[PDB]
């Protein structure tokens, strides 16, 4: 099958910026390429067909170019409704294949997270498992290092991270890190700490099992 590769996987831009998204095919596909826009929870919307032909109802700031194996999608003046994920698709030969997608996100100033730690509830402990949740609230950019320490012992393999999309108010992200332990392991230890590192700042929020 023909492999489609997009670049970059994600990019941050501002309203009014000129944005260019590249799509490359592993084989020549002439001009049989389409571009799509997709927003969270919605179906994709066709933007361009035949590499350069604009689909009806698509603003003229969207334009496509290229042929063979090198294609580009250009947004001349980025608008607030353009922040979304964009896919290319070849229909040169079966099976039809998509690119992995390029996420166009909102650029903003760096923001440090507000860190909160939540012990497991007494209700959950009666089930036999303990979930310890660390919350990183309203930070930018997306990157952050979160480490769990249980009585100064660094934890690994027993935590999962989840990130929200950019907030509609301040364009920041939020992140949860959930430490999952058995009830027995949780009762055998005292100090539970969540260390969040971003840039030149490390913040450790902790609690002592009992207080």
């Amino acid at each position: 099958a023909i492999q489609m590769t997009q670049s970059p996987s994600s990019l941050s831009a501002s309203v009014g910026d000129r944005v260019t998204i590249t799509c490359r095919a592993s084989q020549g596909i002439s001009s049989d390429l389409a571009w799509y826009q997709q927003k969270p929870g919605k179906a994709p919307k066709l933007l361009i067909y035949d590499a350069s032909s604009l689909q009806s109802g698509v603003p003229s700031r969207f334009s496509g170019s290229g042929s063979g194996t090198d294609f580009t999608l250009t947004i001349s003046s980025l608008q607030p409704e353009d922040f979304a994920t964009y896919y290319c698709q070849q229909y040169w030969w079966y099976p039809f294949t998509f690119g992995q997608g390029t996420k166009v996100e909102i650029k903003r100033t760096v923001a440090a997270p507000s860190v909160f730690i939540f012990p497991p509830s007494d209700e959950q402990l009666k089930s036999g498992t303990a979930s310890v949740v660390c919350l990183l609230n309203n930070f930018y950019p997306r990157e952050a290092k979160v480490q769990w320490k249980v009585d100064n012992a660094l934890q690994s393999g027993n935590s999962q991270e989840s990130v929200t999309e950019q907030d509609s108010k301040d364009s920041t992200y939020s992140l949860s890190s959930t430490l999952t332990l058995s009830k027995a392991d949780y009762e055998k230890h005292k100090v539970y700490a969540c260390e969040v590192t971003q840039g030149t700042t490390s913040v450790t929020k902790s609690f002592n099992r009992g207080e």
Partner: protein, 220 residues
């Protein structure tokens, strides 16, 4: 008014079969090629199968050849996808999509709403909702929330105070645990001075199990 409406999604155990339908309206259905496109949770788009206007030609993705069959009833304006020998990797939202052609060239100009297919041996289960309680250990702002743990399948919806509280609400996407069940947290930041007077209740709806849970999150 072009409308494409999928149906037939849900939970199916591995190895079983499931049949999706797509009801079309608003255009001459017999003149356009149709396709199925799927999207795994948090992944990209994958073209699944396509069929010509007169049903005389069908094409399939490599991962589904020999397992899936696409067909159409041009007298009922309905598209079908028969999915046999289903695997966990087939878990995705499935869209039916029209091409502006009698075959399936020139992209996909109209899409349905999508229907979720979850392939797993896990049984349907409503969520257990545990409190993420505040202390105030954070100044004028306090954080609280609800741990929505061990439900199947997707999705759950979370509101706060029956929808009256929307500012500062963050509901994280679910993660699939090793048990096969899903889990997520929903959090909200509130004025810490309100913790003694205002009540905060998360409302968790799980339509697949017909379960709604209301959890009062009180300071501890």
């Amino acid at each position: 008014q072009v409308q494409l409406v999928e149906s037939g999604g849900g939970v199916v155990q591995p190895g079983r079969s499931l049949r999706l339908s797509c009801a079309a309206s608003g255009f001459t259905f017999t003149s356009y090629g149709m396709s199925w496109v799927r999207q795994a949770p948090g992944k990209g788009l994958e073209w699944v199968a396509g069929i010509s206007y007169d049903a005389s030609d069908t094409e399939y993705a490599d991962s589904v050849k020999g397992r899936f069959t696409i067909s159409r009833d041009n007298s009922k304006n309905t598209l079908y996808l028969q999915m046999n020998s289903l695997r966990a990797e087939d878990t995705a939202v499935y869209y039916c999509a029209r091409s502006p052609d009698y075959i399936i060239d020139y992209g996909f100009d109209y899409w349905g709403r999508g229907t979720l297919v979850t392939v797993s041996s896990a049984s349907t289960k409503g969520p257990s909702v545990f409190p993420l309680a505040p202390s105030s250990t954070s100044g004028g702002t306090a954080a609280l929330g609800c741990l929505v743990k061990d439900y199947f399948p997707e999705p759950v919806t979370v509101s706060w105070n029956s929808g009256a509280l929307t500012s500062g609400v963050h509901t994280f996407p679910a993660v699939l645990q090793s048990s096969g069940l899903y889990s997520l947290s929903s959090v909200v930041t509130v004025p810490s001075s309100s913790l003694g007077t205002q009540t905060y209740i998360c409302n968790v709806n799980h339509k697949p199990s017909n379960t709604k849970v209301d959890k009062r999150v009180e300071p501890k």
